[PDB]
Amino acid sequence: MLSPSEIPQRDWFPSDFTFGAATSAYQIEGAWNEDGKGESNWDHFCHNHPERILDGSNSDIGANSYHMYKTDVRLLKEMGMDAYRFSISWPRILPKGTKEGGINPDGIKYYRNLINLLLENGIEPYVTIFHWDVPQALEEKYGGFLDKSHKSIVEDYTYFAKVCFDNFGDKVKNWLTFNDPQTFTSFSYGTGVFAPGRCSPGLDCAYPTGNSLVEPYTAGHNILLAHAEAVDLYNKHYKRDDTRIGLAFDVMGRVPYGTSFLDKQAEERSWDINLGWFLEPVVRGDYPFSMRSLARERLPFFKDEQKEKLAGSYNMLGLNYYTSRFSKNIDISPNYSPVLNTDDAYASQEVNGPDGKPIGPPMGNPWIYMYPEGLKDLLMIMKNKYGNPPIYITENGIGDVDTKETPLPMEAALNDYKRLDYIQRHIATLKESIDLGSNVQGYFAWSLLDNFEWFAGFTERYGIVYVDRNNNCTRYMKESAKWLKEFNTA
Amino acid sequence: VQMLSPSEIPQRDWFPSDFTFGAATSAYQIEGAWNEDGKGESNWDHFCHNHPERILDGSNSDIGANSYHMYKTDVRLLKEMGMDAYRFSISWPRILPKGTKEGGINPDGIKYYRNLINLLLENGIEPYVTIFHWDVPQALEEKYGGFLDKSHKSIVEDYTYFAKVCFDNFGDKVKNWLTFNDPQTFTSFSYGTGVFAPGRCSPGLDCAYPTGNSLVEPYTAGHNILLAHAEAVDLYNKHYKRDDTRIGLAFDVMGRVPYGTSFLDKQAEERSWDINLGWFLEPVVRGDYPFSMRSLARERLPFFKDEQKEKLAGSYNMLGLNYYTSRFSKNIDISPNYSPVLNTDDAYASQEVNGPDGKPIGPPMGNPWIYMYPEGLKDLLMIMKNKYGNPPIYITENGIGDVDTKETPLPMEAALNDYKRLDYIQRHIATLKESIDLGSNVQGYFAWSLLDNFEWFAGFTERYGIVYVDRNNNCTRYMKESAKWLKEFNTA
Numbered sequence: 001m002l003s004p005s006e007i008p009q010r011d012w013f014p015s016d017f018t019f020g021a022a023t024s025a026y027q028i029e030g031a032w033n034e035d036g037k038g039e040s041n042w043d044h045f046c047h048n049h050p051e052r053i054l055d056g057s058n059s060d061i062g063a064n065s066y067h068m069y070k071t072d073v074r075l076l077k078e079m080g081m082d083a084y085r086f087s088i089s090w091p092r093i094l095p096k097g098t099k100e101g102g103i104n105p106d107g108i109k110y111y112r113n114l115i116n117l118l119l120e121n122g123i124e125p126y127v128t129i130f131h132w133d134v135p136q137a138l139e140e141k142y143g144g145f146l147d148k149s150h151k152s153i154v155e156d157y158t159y160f161a162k163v164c165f166d167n168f169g170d171k172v173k174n175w176l177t178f179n180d181p182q183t184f185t186s187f188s189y190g191t192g193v194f195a196p197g198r199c200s201p202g203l204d205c206a207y208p209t210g211n212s213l214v215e216p217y218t219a220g221h222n223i224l225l226a227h228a229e230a231v232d233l234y235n236k237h238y239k240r241d242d243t244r245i246g247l248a249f250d251v252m253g254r255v256p257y258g259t260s261f262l263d264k265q266a267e268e269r270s271w272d273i274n275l276g277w278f279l280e281p282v283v284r285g286d287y288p289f290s291m292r293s294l295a296r297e298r299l300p301f302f303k304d305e306q307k308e309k310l311a312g313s314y315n316m317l318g319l320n321y322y323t324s325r326f327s328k329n330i331d332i333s334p335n336y337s338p339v340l341n342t343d344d345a346y347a348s349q350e351v352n353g354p355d356g357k358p359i360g361p362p363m364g365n366p367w368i369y370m371y372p373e374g375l376k377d378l379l380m381i382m383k384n385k386y387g388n389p390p391i392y393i394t395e396n397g398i399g400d401v402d403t404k405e406t407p408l409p410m411e412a413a414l415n416d417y418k419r420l421d422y423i424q425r426h427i428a429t430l431k432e433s434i435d436l437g438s439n440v441q442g443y444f445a446w447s448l449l450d451n452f453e454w455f456a457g458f459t460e461r462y463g464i465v466y467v468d469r470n471n472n473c474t475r476y477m478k479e480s481a482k483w484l485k486e487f488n489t490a
Numbered sequence: 491v492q493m494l495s496p497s498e499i500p501q502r503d504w505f506p507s508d509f510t511f512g513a514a515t516s517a518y519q520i521e522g523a524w525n526e527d528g529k530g531e532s533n534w535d536h537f538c539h540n541h542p543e544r545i546l547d548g549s550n551s552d553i554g555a556n557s558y559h560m561y562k563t564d565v566r567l568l569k570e571m572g573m574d575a576y577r578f579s580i581s582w583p584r585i586l587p588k589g590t591k592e593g594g595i596n597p598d599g600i601k602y603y604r605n606l607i608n609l610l611l612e613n614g615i616e617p618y619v620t621i622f623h624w625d626v627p628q629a630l631e632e633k634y635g636g637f638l639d640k641s642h643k644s645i646v647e648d649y650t651y652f653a654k655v656c657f658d659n660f661g662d663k664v665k666n667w668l669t670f671n672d673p674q675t676f677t678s679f680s681y682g683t684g685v686f687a688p689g690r691c692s693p694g695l696d697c698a699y700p701t702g703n704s705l706v707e708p709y710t711a712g713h714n715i716l717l718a719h720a721e722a723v724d725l726y727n728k729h730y731k732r733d734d735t736r737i738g739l740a741f742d743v744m745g746r747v748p749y750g751t752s753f754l755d756k757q758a759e760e761r762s763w764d765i766n767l768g769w770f771l772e773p774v775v776r777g778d779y780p781f782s783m784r785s786l787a788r789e790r791l792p793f794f795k796d797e798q799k800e801k802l803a804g805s806y807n808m809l810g811l812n813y814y815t816s817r818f819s820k821n822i823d824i825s826p827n828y829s830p831v832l833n834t835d836d837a838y839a840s841q842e843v844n845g846p847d848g849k850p851i852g853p854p855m856g857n858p859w860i861y862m863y864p865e866g867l868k869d870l871l872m873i874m875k876n877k878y879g880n881p882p883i884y885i886t887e888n889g890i891g892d893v894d895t896k897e898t899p900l901p902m903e904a905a906l907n908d909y910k911r912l913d914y915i916q917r918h919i920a921t922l923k924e925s926i927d928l929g930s931n932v933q934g935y936f937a938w939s940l941l942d943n944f945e946w947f948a949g950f951t952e953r954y955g956i957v958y959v960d961r962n963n964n965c966t967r968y969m970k971e972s973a974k975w976l977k978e979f980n981t982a
């Protein structure tokens with residue numbers, strides 16, 4: 001729907017700006033139990049609770065990228081992508097998740113080959129160390145990130161990072177410790193829609209014996225400690241002048257529902273519980289004041305030493321942006337009691353504004369509404385409030401619904417103009433944000449490939465590249481990929 | 491000393507013709523005749539009489555400025571200065587000796603305020619009447635602790651009746667009512683730090699009665715004040731309001747400026763405006779306390795019933811703002827190492843006179859706490875304008891206290907040449923013009939303290955008047971340079 005002069009041009013951005021595509025291990029790799037790979041929390045969840053996956057599927061094969069990585073690289077190369085962000089499977093590297101469990105040589109070999117091939121083709125690898133795939137051995141031993149000691153998971157995650165640094169550090173110049181920590185903690189232990197599927201008694205999830213008001217925070221605390229530790233290790237023994245490390249946050253833009261100053265306050269609390277939760281700790285060493293005043297004793301305290309390691313523990317930050325919501329105020333009162341950790345923001349997140357209209361056009365699936373302006377707001381907040389650090393939009397895209405009840409014909413799947421329009425608009429927003437002073441340095445189209453979508457299973461295709469699972473996971477560029485190719489190679 | 495240049499000095503024609511300039515006072519501070527003509531004992535009579543040690547110079551206001559007997563001269567000074575209005579308060583115990591209906595109305599009390607009001611009006615001076623200015627009848631204090639009334643009922647009904655008496659006897663003449671004045675200072679100082687009557691505070695704290703709870707009582711009192719206000723305004727709107735009459739309340743407020751550039755201090759600043767101004771402003775504006783306060787004080791801050799929120803929301807036609815100075819708000823993180831002691835600590839922010847550069851926010855005006863920072867007044871007005879509906883505003887108090895102690899007496903000559911005060915007054919008046927140009931709905935300015943009088947725990951160690959009171963003589967009044975300039979300004 002954009003005019004020719006509105007369609008982003010590569011020369012709109014600096015020569016050193018980077019464009020790429022991204023993926024996550026469990027979503028695309030497959031070979032879930034091959035070549036020594038250990039079982040992950042997701043293998044476990046999908047295998048034991050198909051009823052918790054919309055289409056009862058699993059990612060035993062995913063996009064088969066473990067075996068087809070060479071093709072994934074060819075595709076990235078043909079599109080002229082400057083970089084590729086992928087994650088490393090913790091259990092594929094450490095089957096038992098620990099040092100004593102030993103390192104899986106085949107796991108190391110796979111990522112080593114992928115990294116070299118990428119670099120061989122002039123593509124920069126942005127390596128995400130962890131993308132929700134916790135080794136089931138750690139889950140069973142101490143609950144994974146639910147580790148009440150704030151020690152075991154931290155040490156185990158740190159060793160995992162070490163193994164990644166030791167084996168790929170000479171080639172990798174860009175590391176991301178965690179990806180979407182907020183969604184991980186909230187969905188895995190709040191609503192329990194993600195593995196292992198825990199939530200408060202009374203709530204509907206596989207294991208309603210957790211605490212949706214506490215476990216998400218415990219896990220979040222351990223993630224931050226893990227991040228801080230991994231970064232301290234990186235800086236002390238692996239960082240080089242031109243290498244960088246950080247983490248990527250999942251974030252929905254927030255806009256005051258109404259004009260009342262109350263909604264502005266609600267909006268502020270929403271940015272805090274969504275973005276600040278993990279951003280403020282790495283920026284200043286502690287959680288947002290709002291969260292501490294609201295979650296109170298349910299939000300763990302950091303030791304002074306931990307605050308120090310946390311503050312400034314990054315050289316760049318990733319932002320995973322898809323949509324935004326209107327934040328509507330909720331007063332503290334005897335009539336309201338938070339149920340989910342996310343309810344601690346005392347604000348309902350609305351899709352429709354007070355005028356009954358969606359914040360932005362629906363992109364197809366249950367939650368993505370196109371609102372590029374939210375990305376700008378986000379970038380302006382990063383610029384003006386959090387020190388304008390180097391930013392990478394590590395994820396941005398939409399999911400095309402493709403269900404058994406309503407299959408998406410391959411032809412229609414390839415003509416993803418809605419996705420194309422969406423991507424172009426957000427890329428344009430970056431150009432605008434850059435001129436406004438934003439220190440954004442890159443954009444990664446989310447999902448190089450159509451793959452497993454967690455609890456949504458295979459009901460959505462997020463790739464810019466189509467994967468025909470019925471035919472040996474053959475990949476085909478969608479219109480979006482073709483435009484990105486043109487854009488990059490112009 | 492560094493005063494405004496001729497072109498900078500405010501002129502009356504800078505403001506609309508309907509803008510109002512006046513002076514203010516409070517009953518216990520100037521009246522005197524503490525036990526004359528049937529007047530009942532107040533919490534302050536009690537406090538000063540029983541705890542002289544809690545008053546800096548050990549004085550009391552048994553006489554004050556002897557305004558009960560000299561009100562005529564007070565009105566003369568107001569007239570001579572060409573003031574448009576006069577804000578004074580009514581002594582609850584002087585009107586209702588027992589503080590209750592069954593206790594009866596004191597004829598002499600009624601007569602006094604009636605004569606004062608009539609003399610003001612026959613002189614073309616508009617009376618802005620403050621129903622309550624901290625002087626709670628001791629009978630109510632002994633009966634149920636006054637505003638500490640744990641049932642949130644008795645004090646509400648007694649205040650409401652008091653208000654009724656005032657509306658009944660002076661409503662025909664008074665067109666501007668203020669239910670309360672400085673509720674924040676009253677609750678915080680009377681039950682937080684305990685420097686105000688009755689002098690209560692948490693055990694371990696230094697006050698006459700360290701058996702209270704500095705983290706709860708100030709809130710209880712504040713809650714009762716808000717309910718009292720809501721009930722009185724409801725009574726007023728229903729039976730006494732006329733198209734040309736207005737009612738509201740005045741808040742004591744210090745401007746807040748972020749200590750540093752960190753966003754944390756901006757948050758601290760916001761929390762500080764909330765606990766100082768929002769505490770009582772938000773309830774009358776939207777019907778409930780600031781979110782920050784509810785999130786921080788939690789259960790120590792009472793909840794309003796739905797019917798109460800309804801009565802509170804919009805319970806005013808105008809608001810008074812008592813502004814003197816400002817502070818830099820410095821963030822304090824929530825942590826196990828920090829526990830609030832005073833209700834005001836709930837804002838999680840230190841209030842600093844000096845900024846990161848070690849310099850005061852503004853020039854010191856003399857007493858222990860006033861620093862000249864009129865820009866703070868502008869900030870405050872912009873907040874009322876942009877955040878709270880831009881309601882009609884009256885700077886119901888503004889001035890400084892000239893120190894005058896036994897050890898360091900202030901010679902009458904020096905007391906009369908109050909150029910520090912004059913400069914301060916002129917600058918704030920100028921700030922109002924600037925604020926008006928920025929769209930502020932401010933409609934008046936009241937120089938705080940028509941007269942030198944009793945200054946609560948500071949006793950007579952400070953002269954806040956624009957008019958000097960020679961207590962050695964028979965409280966004879968003499969216009970200070972500030973008063974003389976106001977006269978010139980008003981009558982130009």
Ligand SMILES: N#C[C@@H](O[C@@H]1O[C@H](CO)[C@@H](O)[C@H](O)[C@H]1O)c1ccc(O)cc1
Nearest residue numbers: 180183250320367395446453454456462
């Ligand atoms: N995960 C998550 C949330 O983030 C995005 O969810 C997409 C859905 O599969 C995923 O493809 C993308 O990589 C994630 O960044 C999320 C938000 C809302 C709902 O309903 C589910 C997940």
Ligand SMILES: N#C[C@@H](O[C@@H]1O[C@H](CO)[C@@H](O)[C@H](O)[C@H]1O)c1ccc(O)cc1
Nearest residue numbers: 672675742812858859887938945948954
């Ligand atoms: N804040 C404060 C003080 O309460 C204002 O004080 C004025 C001085 O006369 C009074 O006229 C006005 O009504 C009040 O709003 C204060 C007094 C003493 C000390 O030690 C601290 C603060």
